Each structure stands twice: as structure tokens, then as C-alpha cells.
Amino acid sequence: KAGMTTIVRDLDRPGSKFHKREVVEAVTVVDTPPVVVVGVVGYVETPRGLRSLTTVWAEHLSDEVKRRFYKNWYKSKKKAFTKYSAKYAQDGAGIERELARIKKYASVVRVLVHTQIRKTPLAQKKAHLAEIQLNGGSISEKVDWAREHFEKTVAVDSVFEQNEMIDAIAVTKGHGFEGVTHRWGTKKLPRKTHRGLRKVACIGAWHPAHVMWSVARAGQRGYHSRTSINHKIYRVGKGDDEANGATSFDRTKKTITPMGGFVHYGEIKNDFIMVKGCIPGNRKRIVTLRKSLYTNTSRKALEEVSLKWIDTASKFGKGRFQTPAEKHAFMGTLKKD
Amino acid sequence: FNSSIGRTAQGKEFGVTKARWPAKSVKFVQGLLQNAAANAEAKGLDATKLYVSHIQVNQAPKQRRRTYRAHGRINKYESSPSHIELVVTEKLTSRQRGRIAAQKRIA
Amino acid sequence: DVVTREYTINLHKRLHGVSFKKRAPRAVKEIKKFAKLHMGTDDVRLAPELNQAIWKRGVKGVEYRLRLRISRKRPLFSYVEPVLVASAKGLQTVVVE
RNA sequence: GAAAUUGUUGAAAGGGAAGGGCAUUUGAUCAGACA
RNA sequence: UUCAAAUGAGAACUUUGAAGACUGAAGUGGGGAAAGGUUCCACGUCAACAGCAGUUGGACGUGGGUUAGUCGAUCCUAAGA
RNA sequence: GUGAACAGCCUCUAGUUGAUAGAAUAAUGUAGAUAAGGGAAGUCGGCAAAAUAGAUCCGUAACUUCGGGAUAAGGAUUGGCUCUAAGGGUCGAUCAACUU
RNA sequence: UUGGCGGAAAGGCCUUGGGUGCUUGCUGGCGAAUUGCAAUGUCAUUUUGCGUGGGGAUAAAUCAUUUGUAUACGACUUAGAUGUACAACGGGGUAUUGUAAGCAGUAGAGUAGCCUUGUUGUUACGAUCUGCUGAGAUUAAGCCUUUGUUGUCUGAUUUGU
Ligand SMILES: [Cl-]
Ligand SMILES: [Cl-]
Ligand SMILES: [Cl-]
Ligand SMILES: [Mg+2]
Ligand SMILES: [Mg+2]
Ligand SMILES: [Mg+2]
Ligand SMILES: [Mg+2]
Ligand SMILES: [Mg+2]
Ligand SMILES: [Mg+2]
Ligand SMILES: [Mg+2]
Ligand SMILES: [Mg+2]
Ligand SMILES: [Mg+2]
Ligand SMILES: [Mg+2]
Ligand SMILES: [Mg+2]
Ligand SMILES: [Mg+2]
Ligand SMILES: [Mg+2]
Ligand SMILES: [Mg+2]
Ligand SMILES: [Mg+2]
Ligand SMILES: [Mg+2]
Ligand SMILES: [Mg+2]
Ligand SMILES: [Mg+2]
Ligand SMILES: [Mg+2]
């Protein structure tokens, strides 16, 4: 997640007062460089639930993924996957043997992918590794697809498209220990209250002689897992395309990055996804975008969205200019130049 | 004696969460370790083999002061002294017999 | 080894949001921490002339920038002195022969 | 130089108390007849 | 409150210098009545006391110090005894 | 010095710099504060808080023991700078005050 | 040893070939005692340790330091042994305020002084105004960026089927 901005578009909604009229909406931008496939995993149905049977890794792994396996990378000998790579040094009978096992027994196939964290302006340098399920085709086709994509990159435009409802999964911003008044939204006690007023006056009756689980108590606020659904994609952005922040109406040559860069994040030099509304999590946090679990047809979806204007003024203050050229034209020459 | 004390990451070496840095008690122990090593050298023991084979702390008689409380009351205000000592050192029935006899001549 | 260099320390960002009664004493400890980072010496000694420069405008009137001369001498310790300049702006690290 | 209470060493047990009664297993320890 | 030096086995707290501050003349200044009784001053010294510390102290040990014809008491009488 | 002022605020002389410290800045507190639109709907009750505030000029009701009520209520003005007028002492001259 | 099958916790089942042992399917020949008239009369499989020799493999974690997407303390998330490395400064961008100091002016309500009484007399005092000047200052402390400058990069502890 990089940050938020504003867009202007026409509303296509018959029967509404603002039909065929411009509306102003907030959007969230997610920086999405291509992910790299580095393995596959097969799952077997069991009376006790799904069980992973075998994992097969790619022959070569970059230092980004290898950093995930270390806590003290700078002191390590970097021996990870050194003996496993020897399985490819032969004809490949060992690798082919495990792939046949996945084809024969597995009923669910997932691929191990990792982000290219070096392409972001972040300082982490350690990539995030995750499993993504493959849908479509038979079990053999899924394994063959995973095998051919080892050490390759998959772009975001091959997964999502325009005007598609997606779900965002992330961890919310943390706030530490919080009192009941803001953690749960209980009423503040009168000003006359002795011993403090940001509390719950009665936490339980005499019987049962215990505090119940359903009573509001002070504790940790934030940093929770959340799954927010039904977010429409407004734009699938291209990293190498100049005029990312341009529309068919604005026609100015400008990228999606606002003047001065995204606050606390930086510049967007990769592909991005523009999502209507707000998304759980703060800036610089890793997020997972997932396709919807059902076919939505409430006419809020299926609507074709065409952006007219994208705000690129500075978010570090009351920004007034979209581009440096606009500032120079309005102000003229300065003593600095 | 660790009730309601803080916890630190430096306790993971000894598999605990609660640990502290009692500087004053450390200095008293250091002085006695120095004295014991000097005594060992005077006797003629090998310093490289010395290990602490005995160390023991006992309660000394308390030293008493007074503290003043609300509504004109007086409570005690006492110290807990210690006694410290340490030592360093250089590092068949007849039926059973018949069965045994039978087995000897059987193999 | 023994070396003398001149530094510019940004005290504005190091005293951001500090209680007014503690800003000048905090600047003393920040300078000692600053000398530890660059010279790697546990012992840091501040000249009384530098102490006057820090407290020039009261307990809460510390300058935004200070020009410091740091000398590492003989196991080793760092000695910090002020440098008399019109302004501390636009100066980078230089080595003093 | 007793008890409450405490340190060290040794042995033993411990899934929201501990202690007790009857019986036996296991470990440790011990008197009595060799007429 | 801060920097440095001196002393010391040991210094956030002792001494000196420098800096930053406060009381702001109905004072955190300069004297007294009552009450206390050597707490005054010098040297030596840190077990206990100064609810942290201590080389410092109204602490501990040993000594020194209060000079009137004119300042008070003394004399007079008050309510009263 | 400011000002009506032994008010509050700052300084000179003189005297102190003494009250366990270091690090961090969660909840809940104690103390000090600010809030869009509404304006007592809160509460036993405007509790608490807010508003008003010096001075000069204008203006001031019922009632009344004629003394009051009264700062009733209700309005206006206030910096800095450069000037002007008036208000004195001693013997035409000469010298010296902040008041409007 | 050959081949096949079994993934629900497969760790098992079936099969090919030869070697070697036994065979009570049938007929023989030797041995047993004394544990004294019974005494479980000791024939199982659990785990671990120390010594033999026959192969096999040559790492990490924690503390300390650092980061703020985290945080009462622990915990969490990052970085650091030669580099699209990290840090401290500097430069640029982005922001906030609203035109710095200094110098100059035939700007400026007016009032004084001098000789030379000057058809802007000069010289002093004078809130303020104008020009240089959308200037100057501040800008990550939880903003972005960097072919510049100067540095930094082997301390401690513990873990084995
Ligand atoms: Cl009492
Ligand atoms: Cl609070
Ligand atoms: Cl932390
Ligand atoms: Mg809410
Ligand atoms: Mg009350
Ligand atoms: Mg913003
Ligand atoms: Mg407890
Ligand atoms: Mg507590
Ligand atoms: Mg008390
Ligand atoms: Mg009392
Ligand atoms: Mg005795
Ligand atoms: Mg006892
Ligand atoms: Mg005051
Ligand atoms: Mg003052
Ligand atoms: Mg004295
Ligand atoms: Mg004490
Ligand atoms: Mg002491
Ligand atoms: Mg309001
Ligand atoms: Mg309002
Ligand atoms: Mg009401
Ligand atoms: Mg009500
Ligand atoms: Mg009130």
C-alpha cells in the first residue's frame, strides 16, 4: 500500500439524481511489481482436513527469497538450498519423481511466490513469501503450469482487470493499549465521576459471580487481521508507461506519483492497482488482493468506470499545482532560477 | 524473590523472563571472589582449575529505622543485611544352582 | 589513530518535541552520543566553552545547528570543541591537518 | 543454644490446594535367632 | 539544572571556576521577643543518623569562644497578687 | 520600571540553586488547555466552565424611609508618530513641574 | 534378488529366481539322572549411557548494536563482515509563513538650527512608505530524492536426533 488520492468520473446510474454527472471519489493505490514463482505444493483430502503432501522448489533462488530464511543474514554462510540444488544437477529424476506424486495424489495445487521488494522504495530488502491457489484446469495442467513458470515473473494485469470487484486482506494499523472508551465506543461517564470517567460503570451483576466475556475491557487496539470485500478496480497501471496519471480527458503527461512523492512511501515506478475507497492497513504494509468468492451483479458491479481526472497535487500540505510546469506558469520566474 | 518485577530480553540466556542488574550485591560478591583467589594462590593451588564449589547467603540481624504514616502512626523501616561465604576448589537356592549347573554342561 | 575533524550536528531534529526544562541538558547527551558514533570512543569530554555555546539562549533556546571540532586522542577518548563561524549552514565534514 | 522463620547440599513427588484412614507394590533403612 | 578542574579507594550530591536560573525590598535579604541550649568556631573523622548517595553536615571525637558607670535586668506603679 | 497602587509581571543589592536519580512516552488518573454546527435538549439543581472586566465620554427604569436604587439597564472610544493650545516661580527678563 | 501395487495415519501386501538351514511324511541308533517330592525357576521389549570400526555431513540462534509499518515492560518488524551496503552532513524537490538583514530614495504628517537668508537652501530629528525581495527563515524529528563530502563494517553467549 502506497497511499490515497482523489479522482473525478461520470456516474452511470439510471434513476439517480447524479446520473450522467461528475462525482468526486477517494481511491487507494497499491504498488504491485511482478511476483516470482519459486515452487509448488500439493494437498490431499483427509478425514482430518487438507494435508500438504510434497513441496517442490525451483533450481535457483535469488537473495531476496533466501533472506526470508535467515535472522542473521550478514553472518550466515548462506547454505540454504545448496544441497537441494544438487537434485537438478542430475538428469532431474528426483524433481520429476516428486512432480509425478503431486499429479497422482493431490487434489489442491498451490504455487509459492515471492515479491520483488528491491523494486519498491522500501528499505526492507527481505521478500515476502506466500502460497496462492491455482484455479482452472485439471491437476496435471496445474502442475505443468507451475513447472514452466519456475523462476519466471507473473504480472498483475494477468490476474486482475478493469471494473473488477476484489477483496483486500491485511493487518490494520496498531495503536497499542487502549481504554474502553475508544476501544469499544462506550459512553463517557459524567464530569462528577470520582476515580475517572473513561470507564464502564457496571461490569457485571452479583450473579453469576464472575466477569463475563461480553463486557468491554481495556486492551490492545489495532494490528488485527481483516478481510474487506467488494472493492472495485478503477485502473490497472503500467510501470513503464509514462502518463500513468493521465486520462482520455486530461491528456497531460504525468505519472501517478504526486508532487513530492507519496508521504512516507516514495515514488511509484512499478505497476499499480487503483482501488475505490479505503483499504485496511497503513502505508508500506504488505497487502493481499484476492478475487471475489461469488458472482456479484447488484449493478454496483458490472458498471464501466472511465476516469476523467486524477489528482496529483502534493499530499504534504495544501497542494495547489498538479505538475511542476503548472507552478512555473502560474508563478513565473523566481530568484532561485 | 521475583514477584512483580520487570521482564527483559537478557533473561533468555537462562530460560527466564524476569531478570535484573543488582550492582550493589555484585560488588560485594566480587570482593569475596578476589579474596578467595588470593587465599588460593597463597596456599599454592592451580588458578586455571578453580571453580566455585560452594556459595551461600544467610540473613544477618536487621537494622531498624522509623517511618511516619498518616494520622500520627509510626511503622518500621528496616534493612536486610547478608552473611556471605564461598569456597573455591580445583577441578542362590539349590534349585537355582542345579539350573546353572545344567546349563554349563548343556552348551 | 589520532585524527581531528569538523562536523555539523543538526540539534533541531534531535530535540524535536522535548520538554522545555530538559532541552539544553538533552543537547549535552546528544553531542556525546554524536561523538560516539563517529569516533567510536566510550569516553567523551566536552570543553566548557562548548557548554556555554549550548546554554547561550537559556534552557530551551538551543541553536538548530552547531559546528563542532572533534579530536580523538590517547586507551582513546574524544574531545569536542566549538568552532567560531558566522553561520553553521552549508558546511560539510572536513579533515583538519 | 529449642521453636517459629531462612540459606546451601542431598533424596522424592507435583494436569485448578495441601494434609489424613485401610491395604499392598516399589525405593531407602533397621532390630531380633543362628544353639 | 549543565561543563571542567581539584580531592578521594570510591563523586548526579564535597570544594573552586564557568554557564543557565529563581527569591524580586509585605524577599529564599538584614535584625530581634518568646522557646531551644552550645546547635556558634577550628581541627580531626564516617560505624550509626541526614527514608538515594556522601570525601559533606545542625552527625561523631577533641578543644576554643559570650568582656558594659552609659544596652537591659535591677527602681516605679497598672489590672491584680 | 510598568501601573491608581505595599496588585500582578521583569530587574539591581544581598541570599539560594536545596526537595533520590536515569530511560521511555501505553491505558486510567491529577493539574493546565482548545474545539466544527446546535446552545441547558444535560442535571435534583447551569454543579463546573464560559461570557463580563481598566479608563474617558454618552445614557440610565420601577420603587423609595428621598439618603438611595446605580457601575442600574444600554452605547462609543483607547496604539505609534509629528505638532498645537491652556494651566506656573523668582525678579521686560530668567528658571522649572506632569496635567488636560 | 526380480517385478508390480498401496497416500486416510501409505511405512504394508503380493510376486520372480537362486543360495543355505530344518523337516515329525516313514524307518533306525545314541544323549538326558543329582534342580534330590513343588517354589516365575529367569528364554519377553522400553529408553538411555560408555567403549569397538564401517560409511556420511562441515550450521545456526540469541545477547549487544540498528530500524518504527511495532511497542507499558517482554514481544513484533527491519538493517549491519566490501556493497544499485549503511550512516552523518551537504545539494535538490515538496511544504509553512508572508517579504529578512543591510544599503539607498526627489516617499513621509510636520518642528527646529546655521551662516550665505538660499525662485526643492543645506544640515539635522521623524511612526511609516518604496526598491533590491513571492524575499528571508524552517522543512523529518514517523516527508520524497541523491554519480557530492566524510566515515563505519569479526564483540559476547548458547544450542545435537
Ligand atoms: Cl503507631
Ligand atoms: Cl491520560
Ligand atoms: Cl521494543
Ligand atoms: Mg470509529
Ligand atoms: Mg465526588
Ligand atoms: Mg497530507
Ligand atoms: Mg503477580
Ligand atoms: Mg506496580
Ligand atoms: Mg509518611
Ligand atoms: Mg502528628
Ligand atoms: Mg553460645
Ligand atoms: Mg527450625
Ligand atoms: Mg515568580
Ligand atoms: Mg525573577
Ligand atoms: Mg557549623
Ligand atoms: Mg540514606
Ligand atoms: Mg551510606
Ligand atoms: Mg463548540
Ligand atoms: Mg463555533
Ligand atoms: Mg431539562
Ligand atoms: Mg433528562
Ligand atoms: Mg459556579
Dig out the grid coordinates for B16 from the structure: 527466564
Beta-sheet pairing, B73-79 with B63-69:
antiparallel
C-alpha span between A229 and A209 (Å, rounded): 41
**Intra-chain end-to-end CA distance of chain C, in Å:** 13
User: Is A209 in a helix, a strand, or coil?
Assistant: coil
Q: How far is ligand 3, taken at its centre, from the CA of residue B7, in Å?
A: 12
Distances (CA, A) of B21 to A222, B16, B26, B31, B84: 34, 14, 8, 17, 19
CATH number of A34-154: 3.30.1430.10
- Nearest Cα to A234, choosing from A2, A23, A9, A1? A9
Distances (CA, A) of A117 to A32, A79, A113, A333, C36: 10, 22, 12, 41, 33
- Nearest Cα to A279, choosing from A238, A235, A237, A227? A227
- Three-class HEC string of B36-81: HHHHHHHHCCCHHHEEEEEEEEEECCCEEEEEEECCCEEEEEEECC
Distances (CA, A) of A291 to A195, A281, A288, B83: 51, 18, 10, 72
C-alpha span between A4 and A25 (Å, rounded): 11
Burial class (CB within 10 angstroms; exposed 0-12, middle 13-18, buried 19+) of B9: exposed
Looking at chain C, the residues that come just before a C–N gap of over 2.5 A are: 74
C-alpha span between A229 and A277 (Å, rounded): 11
Whether C4 and C31 have beta carbons less than 8 Å apart is answered as no
Q: How far is ligand 7, taken at its centre, from the CA of residue B7, in Å?
A: 12
- Nearest Cα to A156, choosing from A54, A291, A40? A291
Beta-sheet pairing, A288-291 with A307-310:
unpaired
C-alpha span between C24 and A24 (Å, rounded): 50
Whether C11 and C27 have beta carbons less than 8 Å apart is answered as yes
Per the entry, the structure determination technique was: cryo-EM
Report domain extents, chain A: 1-33+155-172+222-336, 34-154
In this structure, CATH architecture of domain A1-33+155-172+222-336: Beta Barrel (2.40)
Distances (CA, A) of A199 to A21, A150, A157, A177, A210: 48, 56, 50, 14, 18
Beta-sheet pairing, A165-171 with A225-237:
antiparallel
Report domain extents, chain C: 6-88
As a rounded value in angstroms, the CA-to-C1' distance for C58 and E13 is 23
Helix count (H) and strand count (E) of chain B?
A: 2, 4
Whether C74 and C2 have beta carbons less than 8 Å apart is answered as yes
As a rounded value in angstroms, the CA-to-C1' distance for C61 and G66 is 30
C-alpha span between A115 and A129 (Å, rounded): 7
Give strand pairing partners of B75: B67
Contacts 24+ apart (CB under 8 A), C50-59: C50/C80, C50/C81, C50/C82, C53/C82, C54/C24, C54/C27, C54/C28, C55/C24, C58/C24, C59/C20, C59/C21, C59/C23, C59/C24, C59/C25
- Nearest Cα to C82, choosing from C1, C2, C8, C3? C8
C-alpha span between A299 and A191 (Å, rounded): 49
As a rounded value in angstroms, the CA-to-C1' distance for A337 and D14 is 83
Dump the DSSP string for A15-61.
TSTTTTSEEEEEEEEEE-PPEEEEEEEEEE--TT--EEEEEEE-S--
User: Is A172 in a helix, a strand, or coil?
Assistant: coil
Dump the DSSP string for A97-153.
HHHHHHHHH-SEEEEEEE--GGGSS-S-----EEEEE--SS-HHHHHHHHHHTTT-E
Resolution (A): 2.2
In this structure, what DSSP letter does residue C11 have?
H
Neighbours of C (≥3 Cβ pairs closer than 8 A)?
none
Prior bond of A190 cis (ω within 30°): no
Whether A200 and A179 have beta carbons less than 8 Å apart is answered as no
C-beta atoms surrounding B91 within 10 Å: 8
Q: What angle do CA C14, C18, C21 make, to 5 degrees?
A: 125
Q: How far is ligand 14, taken at its centre, from the CA of residue C19, in Å?
A: 21
Give strand pairing partners of A31: A272
Distances (CA, A) of C23 to A63, B29, B83, C7, C44: 44, 40, 46, 21, 20
Nearest-nucleotide field for B57 (CA, C1'): D7
